[PDB]
Symmetry: none
Subunit: 41 residues, 6 copies
């Protein structure tokens, strides 16, 4: 019925939820993402 | 009925939940992600 | 009925839950992820 | 700051909530009231 | 800060919650009240 | 800070919660009240 595919090919960090499928519920989902630094290529 | 696939090919750290499938529940899910540093390629 | 596949090919650390399938429950799931350092490639 | 007074002087049945003071929450409050019969004075 | 007073002087049955003060929570409160009969005065 | 007073002077049965003060919680409180009979005065 439902499908979810996530693909990432990057050096960047992942912050948060992936393929979140909250359904028929009751809740204030909160996602907090902080990153304080430097990245290079 | 439902499927979930997650693929990542990156040096970056993973922060959070992957393939979270909360269903028919009651809860304030909270995700906190912090990273203070530097990455290279 | 439901499937969940998670694949990662990265040097980055994993922080959090993987393939979390909370269902028909009642609970404020909380995920805290902190990392203070540097990574290289 | 806030006050609530409820007074009833009737033979009729009470069905539901009295002085409900839900505050700063998150929930679909549902009240169902059914009565199938006869009353007299 | 907050007060709640409930007074009833009736032969009728009480069905439900009285002085319910849910606060800063997360929950689908449900009240079901059924009465199938006859009352007299 | 908060007060709750409940007074009833009726022959009717009490069905449910009285002076319920759920606070800073997470739960789907459910109240079910059924009465199938007859009362007199």
């Amino acid at each position: 019925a439902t499908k979810a595919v996530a693909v990432l090919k990057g050096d960047g960090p992942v912050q948060g939820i992936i393929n979140f499928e909250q359904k028929e519920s009751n809740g204030p989902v909160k996602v907090w993402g902080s990153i304080k630094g430097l990245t290079e290529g």
